[PDB]
Amino acid sequence: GRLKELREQLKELTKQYEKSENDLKALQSVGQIVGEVLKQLTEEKFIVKATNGPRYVVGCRRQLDKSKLKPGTRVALDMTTLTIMRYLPRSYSEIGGLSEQIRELREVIELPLTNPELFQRVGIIPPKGCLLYGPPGTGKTLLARAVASQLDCNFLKVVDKYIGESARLIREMFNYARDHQPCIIFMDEIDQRTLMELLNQMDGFDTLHRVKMIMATNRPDTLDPALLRPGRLDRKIHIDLPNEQARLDILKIHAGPITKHGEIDYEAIVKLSDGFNGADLRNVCTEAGMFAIRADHDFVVQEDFMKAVRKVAD
């Protein structure tokens, strides 16, 4: 017994001493100044700039793999010789009836995303994107992130020009987008010679990677005839008019994640208020939940929805 602690003690005696050697050895590194490879002046020397601003010319130390040190590459240089060292780069249907959504949109979004061989054999460049238009909110604000669900891939939301940074950033993120072929760029709420210049990126500027850049947004008031011309904008999809039954389906979908008695006359509620909008039905559900919170009702009583329906109708 008296020896067991001694065994563990030994591990301790080394442990604190272990750090001493690690601390002493660590107690000598002088660090380095971080900078970027501004350009490859020569296979032996290159022009770099430290984050502080000054620009120098340095060289690989032993083997810095110039093949991978293309113009622009973080590297830390010692402030005694300025040499290159370690380099380190630093719901499918939430709108009820979506037959319109799961149809033309699907057939024009995924079809050009799978078999480029089909079209190139046809000799026709695949359509690059389609435009959706109709009621704001349900058709515009909603079902916008849902496209990722429909395609099951993460998308990028892109909200004359100041300096042209619109097109500049579009291209600069285009490579990232192309790195993920299934990814779809969704420049919703997109809104001279930037929109028209915006018509030139799609033709070239790395647009041969099988991605449908759907310019689907009613926000732009001005419509470009060249864009709607076949090719660029293959076709236009009009957001369907809610029929007050799709409203019932939307209410049911949103009624899902809600605790309630169950005796909900959903048809009565939808007839009470014509929200007409999936976000309006979301607000209806939220207001019903709030009314339930009043008086501390874990459930939601029938009249609470009706108050919610009436409130939104205003």
Add this chain to the structure above:
Amino acid sequence: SVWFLDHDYLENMYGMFKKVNARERIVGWYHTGPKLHKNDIAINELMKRYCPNSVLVIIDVKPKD
């Protein structure tokens, strides 16, 4: 077979050098007398303890060509 490497002096020099230069550490031993005296093997064994793979370097005071 009469060879001595003061352990105390070796350890003390080791410690001093590491204190002034952490990155350094023993890598072997060196001796003169170009004709490698037969004792070398035995001595190397001692170094094998201090370093698992300790190399021996024989240096010449007078270089010819």
